Design a protein around this ligand. Structure first.
Ligand SMILES: NC[C@@H]1O[C@H](O[C@H]2[C@@H](O)[C@H](O[C@@H]3[C@@H](O)[C@H](N)C[C@H](N)[C@H]3O[C@H]3O[C@H](CO)[C@@H](O)[C@H](O)[C@H]3N)O[C@@H]2CO)[C@H](N)[C@@H](O)[C@@H]1O
Ligand SMILES: [Mg+2]
Ligand SMILES: [Mg+2]
Lengths: 62, 149, 221, 137, 178
RNA sequence: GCCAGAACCAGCCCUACUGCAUUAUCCUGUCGGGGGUCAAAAUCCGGCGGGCAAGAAGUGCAAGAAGGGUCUUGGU
RNA sequence: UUAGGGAUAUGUGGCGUCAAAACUUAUGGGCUCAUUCUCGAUACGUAAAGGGUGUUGGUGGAUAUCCACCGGCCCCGAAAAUGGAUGACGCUUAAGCCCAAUUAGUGAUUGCCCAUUAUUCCUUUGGUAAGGGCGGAAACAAAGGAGAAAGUGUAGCCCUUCCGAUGU
RNA sequence: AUCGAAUCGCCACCUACAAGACUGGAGCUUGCUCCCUCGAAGGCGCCAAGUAUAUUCAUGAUCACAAGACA
């Protein structure tokens, strides 16, 4: 179903069935360049294992 | 043809803390180590390299085993082996990554407008030579069409 | 699996463009059988869609007589009470590799069944796989870096033809007919491959010279 | 000194004149020029200019900006307080063009200044094979 | 690999007793990973040769010995080792290395492979750089040829840990995955 | 009295920036006696002349009053 | 070695896939080839005498070649009753065996992965628990707020601090 | 036609083929010398159809699935 996203009243064109869970990279994990992330207030669903996660360039340090 | 490990053979270091630096074999320890020195470079003092980390080049100064560290600087000056290496294409690929690994975002933009220039010119030269000879797929099919339609 | 009329009318009601998923196609000529299988078993389980090609060219270390006996010790196993419920012994090189991948997966969950149905594993290069992009390779598993060249090795298409697998000669005539066909296609366009590179050397000095000494700093001349 | 409006804690790379990358928001991936920083450790204020990439005078903060090595050396007008951006008006449409044309005035008198005007029109995206963690900016 | 053993010169002595008002001071060369191992190999040898304990014991010095110029030399690592059958076998074992402490390290890596002897079942005696014309075995003497010239065949050129990949493109230096 | 973002305090947890001692079985200089070579440089041993091998050593001790964390604590 | 939870760091054991970690690390050294219960491989933990002109080191004799000995890995010795097990796949420029490192003769520290452990931060609960406050300081209407009990045990008189916590 | 969705690199230049004790070509001293194609890039794509004073972009207001998606 189309549940309620942000800018529901301000921007009714981004109203979608699309949801999103958010997190932060906390620390590296091993020598091979994997990251150890924690999602905000919850955990990532186990359905997401093997599925696409986007990591961003913000918050910026450079 | 492969280039032998001998005293005088210039090797390039593969993946040490050097990764790109050339050096001259001044002594062979055993079946897997040599002594490597290039007096022209600061980081290339007389050290011990494993032969899994070296790559023998086509150049070889006429110097003896366990040289005197001042007749080595004489040997690669008369041979001009560092300058013959400095105009090869593989050495240009070494100094090209050193620009890419030091590029700012503005000189990555300059490389993109340089490559889009050359690409735009090579596809309009390819245009105005495919009208004369029917080479491409647009021009083979139209040449075998207008001859019978 | 051809798409049904419910899956065909929706590609007409919605004007569906012809879609291909992001599929990585490995050419397994001269690869270590279990080193390639472990690289593939990890990538499939990280969500990669992988088509595997040329499984009759995989290598297993040791004498051909040695690896053929190890398959016959495997074929000795069967459920004695009812062998229709037994271990099923697949003889194709394309099916030996699917098993070797599968025994490196969590086979008895749904995440390991979603990853074993992401692998296809042909043998030879079939006509649907040929013109779909350049094949890739696994350079940490390629027998010229992984086997000591004095030691014998065993081509999987030759071990498997003597334990079963009655389609060895069919694959050998489908791949003789391909390399003859793909070398006729490659003598063609040699006046197209030379046409572009004599236009990419001619694009220099027809382009402005302040974009060439930035094209020579980064070594792209 | 922390309660003073001139108290900043902003990075030494996000100076006025430094060409930025927007990374977020509406105009993501565009290249905008950093004009100044608002008082009481406020957000950055970037113009594009709109002549080049379509980015108006807008607020953004430091953590949503990659500041690069390339500066244009603006010394332009700073009459953009913390209150044109409060609850296009003809004031903000005039404050745009008065700072807009002062940018192109300062873009072109820069050495290699036409190369930088084209640099402000390009779009930063992440290609499918490039590593932003190994780059100088 | 800049070897795992270091040349310690452990100087020590029994103790000023009233039986023995001035005792004998002993010098000892040991190749040890650190000086705590090196002091204990010293008191091992004070016990089994001089009836001196470490309790009634002074270590006057335990300092490392710096190596040399790095030059390819020939070392006679006159070495002994204990196995349970045929105990205390002593061999001579000429080697070919750039330093003296690296030559003993090579001896500990092929007393471990050729004979399966560990660190504490090995005693090392009289490591000396010998000239070329004294080398007896032809598997070390073959490097004194002034015109060696061998090729590096059958190599394992791996990528440089920053650009290593998983799927490259079969004739191409690309990286389709990783 | 809901969800996010940044900022700044404090606390705590990370990691950058290093000094004091030590070299000698060692460094360098030449005359030997030794080597090998087409001839000779080296490996090697010995005389007495000098010494600092000086981000010099992977050898002993290190006290060098931050840039990043804190959906790893509390606050405004 | 065990209250209810986080963060960091470990231990035993590990780092080819299953399965977290060397996206199969080194810019370390050797040794090993084994053809129908199929070389080998995580202690406790469940094949020998003997043999080998397989290979790789040693020791002592002799005239580039012989002779006697000793060791490492590998083979032979080594034959059972459902199909079968280094845990599985597999591995042989090991993913095996013995040594050794930690990003590598570069310039000194701690490669990283996992606990009901450790350190530390919260909350609970109990102490051979340890301290403080409890004579309402003044002042304050509506159109800054409430509490303050001399107390074993409560919705605990209120705060601060410290240690312990499993169990038939 | 429900249907809003997750996906985010395109090519009639890759999409032929062997080889690693070699694989640019030759010499003969067989480990060195010599030749140009110099032996370590498949091309594109990343905001003017192309490196040149060209002309829209806000108010979607400071992050939010990219509110776009025929390349
Ligand atoms: N398991 C039963 C289900 O639990 C659901 O809730 C489940 C989750 O959706 C839920 O997660 C919520 C999440 O919705 C929301 N985005 C954030 C919230 N903080 C999370 O809750 C989590 O964090 C807090 C920590 O104190 C707790 O309240 C909660 O117990 C914990 N599960 O916690 C439960 C995870 O076990 C719903 N109540 C309902 O679907 C159903 O009752
Ligand atoms: Mg117990
Ligand atoms: Mg009871």
């Amino acid at each position: 179903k189309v549940k309620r996203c942000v800018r529901w009243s301000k921007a009714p064109a981004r109203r979608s069935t699309t949801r999103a869970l958010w997190g932060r990279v906390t620390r590296p994990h091993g020598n091979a360049g994997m990251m150890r992330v924690k999602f905000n207030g919850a955990s990532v669903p186990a359905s997401a294992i093997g599925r696409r996660i986007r990591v961003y360039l913000y918050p910026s340090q450079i | 043809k492969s280039h032998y490990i001998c005293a005088g053979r210039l090797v390039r270091i593969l993946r040490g803390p050097r990764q790109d630096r050339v050096g001259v074999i001044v002594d062979i320890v055993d079946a897997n180590r040599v002594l490597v020195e290039n007096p022209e470079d600061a980081k290339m003092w007389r050290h011990v390299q494993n032969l899994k980390n070296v790559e023998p080049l086509k150049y070889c100064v006429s110097v003896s085993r366990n040289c005197s560290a001042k007749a080595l600087k004489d040997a690669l000056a008369s041979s001009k082996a560092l300058e013959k290496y400095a105009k090869t294409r593989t050495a240009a690929r070494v100094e090209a990554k050193k620009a890419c690994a030091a590029s700012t975002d503005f000189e990555r933009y300059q490389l993109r407008v340089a490559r889009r220039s050359r690409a735009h010119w090579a596809r309009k030269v390819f245009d105005e030579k495919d009208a004369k000879t029917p080479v491409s797929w647009h021009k083979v099919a139209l040449k075998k069409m207008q001859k019978k339609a | 699996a051809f798409p049904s009329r419910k899956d065909a009318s929706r590609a007409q009601r919605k004007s569906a463009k012809k879609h291909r998923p992001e599929i990585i196609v490995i050419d397994l000529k001269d690869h270590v059988l279990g080193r390639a299988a472990a690289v593939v078993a990890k990538q499939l389980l990280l969500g990669k869609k992988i088509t595997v090609v040329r499984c009759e060219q995989l290598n297993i270390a040791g004498t051909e007589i040695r690896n053929k006996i190890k398959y016959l010790q495997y074929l000795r196993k069967r459920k004695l009470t009812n062998p229709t419920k037994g271990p099923f012994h697949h003889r194709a090189p394309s099916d030996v590799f699917v098993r070797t991948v599968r025994s490196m997966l969590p086979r008895y969950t749904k995440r390991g069944m979603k990853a074993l149905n992401s692998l296809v594993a042909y043998e030879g290069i079939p006509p649907n796989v040929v013109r779909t992009g350049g094949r890739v390779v696994i350079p940490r598993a390629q027998r010229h870096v992984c086997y000591r060249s004095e030691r014998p090795y065993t081509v999987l298409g030759n071990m498997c033809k003597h334990v079963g697998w009655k389609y060895s000669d069919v694959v050998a005539n489908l791949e003789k007919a391909r390399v003859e066909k793909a070398s006729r296609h490659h003598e063609k366009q040699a006046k197209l491959r030379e046409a572009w590179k004599a236009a990419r050397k001619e694009a220099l000095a027809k382009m402005p010279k302040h974009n060439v000494e930035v094209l020579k700093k980064f070594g792209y001349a | 000194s922390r309660k003073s409006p001139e108290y900043t804690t902003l990075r030494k790379s996000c100076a006025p004149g430094v060409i930025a990358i927007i990374l977020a928001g509406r105009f993501r991936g565009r290249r905008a020029v950093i004009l100044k920083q608002l008082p009481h450790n406020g957000p950055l204020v970037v113009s594009g200019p709109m002549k080049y990439n379509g980015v108006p005078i807008r607020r953004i903060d430091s953590r949503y900006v990659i500041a690069t090595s390339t500066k244009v050396d603006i010394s332009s007008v700073d009459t953009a307080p913390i209150t044109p951006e409060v609850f296009v008006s003809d004031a903000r449409a005039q404050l745009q063009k008065k700072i807009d044309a002062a940018l192109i005035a300062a873009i072109k008198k820069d050495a290699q200044g036409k190369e930088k005007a084209g640099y402000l029109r390009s779009v930063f995206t992440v290609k499918p094979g490039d590593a932003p963690h190994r780059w100088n900016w | 690999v800049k070897p795992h053993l270091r040349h310690y010169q452990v100087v020590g002595r029994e103790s000023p007793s009233e039986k023995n008002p001035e005792p004998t001071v002993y010098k000892f060369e040991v190749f040890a990973p650190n000086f705590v191992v090196a002091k204990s190999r010293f008191w091992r040898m004070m016990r089994v040769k001089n009836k001196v304990k470490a309790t009634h014991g002074d270590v006057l010095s335990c300092k490392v010995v710096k190596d040399a110029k790095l030059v390819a030399r020939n070392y006679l690592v006159d070495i002994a080792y204990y196995s349970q059958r045929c105990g205390y076998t002593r061999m001579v074992k000429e080697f070919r290395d750039v330093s003296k402490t690296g030559a003993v390290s090579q001896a500990y890596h092929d007393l471990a492979s050729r004979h399966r002897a560990r660190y504490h079942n090995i005693e090392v005696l009289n490591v000396k750089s010998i000239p070329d014309h004294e080398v007896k075995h032809l598997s070390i003497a073959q490097y004194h040829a002034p015109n060696l010239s061998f090729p590096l065949l059958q190599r394992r050129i791996k990528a440089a840990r920053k650009d290593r990949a998983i799927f490259v493109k079969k004739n191409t230096k690309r990286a389709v995955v990783a």
